[PDB]
Amino acid sequence: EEVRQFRRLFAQLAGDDMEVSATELMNILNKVVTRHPDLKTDGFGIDTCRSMVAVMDSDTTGKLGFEEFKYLWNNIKRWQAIYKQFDTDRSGTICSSELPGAFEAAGFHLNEHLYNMIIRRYSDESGNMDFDNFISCLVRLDAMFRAFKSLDKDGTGQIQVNIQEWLQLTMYS
Amino acid sequence: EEVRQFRRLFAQLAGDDMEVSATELMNILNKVVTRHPDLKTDGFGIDTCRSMVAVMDSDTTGKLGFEEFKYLWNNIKRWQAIYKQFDTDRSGTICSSELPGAFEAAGFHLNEHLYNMIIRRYSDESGNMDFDNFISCLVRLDAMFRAFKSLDKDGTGQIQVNIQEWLQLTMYS
Ligand SMILES: O=C(O)C(=S)Cc1c[nH]c2ccc(Br)cc12
Ligand SMILES: O=C(O)C(=S)Cc1c[nH]c2ccc(Br)cc12
Ligand SMILES: [Ca+2]
Ligand SMILES: [Ca+2]
Ligand SMILES: [Ca+2]
Ligand SMILES: [Ca+2]
Ligand SMILES: [Ca+2]
Ligand SMILES: [Ca+2]
Ligand SMILES: [Ca+2]
Ligand SMILES: [Ca+2]
């Protein structure tokens, strides 16, 4: 019902090795955005998709199995509706004054310093963020929240990170 | 003398805001790699160049000033010299067997598991890594080392961070 649609999409998408590569992901996402003329993008490029796959490849197989891919695709789905909803001037892009509302709608309450930092790294010189840049930021933000949580065993708001962990979390990303 | 010349390079490249943007960087890099046929590459792409700038933009102007650019540029020439040198089979790309030597000569000593991750994130399906991916890997690796060391002056092998700090460190990259 729910997951018969989805079980099929995953099987067709993952193909012969039954996992979703960076390329397979790239291609489906560009296919989907083709159908939404209200999402401005210059396309999901390969290195952005390798980075989304790495940050979601928890068992480190190199590729996304069914659960990893399901988690990603349902997020992307929720986040696309948010992008459209908070693009309140229909630029096809999310600008600096739209960005807070959008992020907090996805459950990320950042502060001004952090918002500005995000815009500096993900938005263009006018301070606009296109759809691929938006999704790829969110995937990462979501992963880095969840890696913090996983490390904050005692719920102190402070984590201790050893150099091995640091290098794995930042490089396989 | 080559300090005269390099200031001229910088000035011409940075133009009228006297800083190097990710676009300006992307262009000089692709321009420079065409002179070097032995460096195989599918191009430096805008996302990787935003990432490289962010990683290098210590003073957070969003762009690369003179010292920031020079630092990046000197690493890149050291590393391309290392790339050419460790490509023993002259393939114009760095394979899995050639890789440890090259990272060793850039002075990184990582365990097997970290190598495997890096190869899955940056190399192709035959374990082959091309020049833009190599350079992008090393810029990032170097910066993640320096960020960590900066916060672990005393060599405990651990840093302690809150969520704001963590997000600054892992997203402005
Ligand atoms: O816009 C809609 O009504 C839907 S059902 C979109 C949608 C549903 N699943 C999706 C996955 C990726 C992207 Br981009 C968009 C979608
Ligand atoms: O500039 C040169 O004549 C050489 S031999 C190397 C070099 C000097 N600066 C460089 C910057 C990027 C790359 Br790729 C190579 C170089
Ligand atoms: Ca596949
Ligand atoms: Ca996996
Ligand atoms: Ca807008
Ligand atoms: Ca984009
Ligand atoms: Ca400039
Ligand atoms: Ca700067
Ligand atoms: Ca080679
Ligand atoms: Ca490449």
UniProtKB/Swiss-Prot annotation, chains A, B:
Please cite one Gene Ontology biological process associated with this protein: regulation of macroautophagy
Binding-site residues, Ca(2+) 2:
D57, D59, T61, K63, E68
* Localization, UniProt: Cytoplasm; Cell membrane
State if Repeat is listed as a keyword.
yes
Work out whether the entry's keyword set contains Mitochondrion.
no
The UniProt record gives the binding positions of Ca(2+) 1 as A14, D17, E19, E24
Q: Binding of Ca(2+) 4: at which residues?
A: D42, D130
Q: Give binding positions for Ca(2+) 3.
A: D87, D89, S91, T93, E98
Q: What does the UniProt record say this protein does? A: Regulatory subunit of the calcium-regulated non-lysosomal thiol-protease which catalyzes limited proteolysis of substrates involved in cytoskeletal remodeling and signal transduction. Essential for embryonic development.
* Subunit structure and binding partners: Homodimer or heterodimer of a large (catalytic) and a small (regulatory) subunit. In presence of calcium, the heterodimer dissociates.
- Reported disease: Pulmonary hypertension, primary, 6: A form of primary pulmonary hypertension, a disease defined by plexiform lesions of proliferating endothelial cells in pulmonary arterioles. The lesions lead to elevated pulmonary arterial pression, right ventricular failure, and death. Primary pulmonary hypertension exhibits incomplete penetrance, sex bias and variable age of onset, both within and between families. PPH6 is an autosomal recessive form.
Q: What is this protein called?
A: Calpain small subunit 1
In its UniProt entry, the species of origin is given as Homo sapiens (Human)
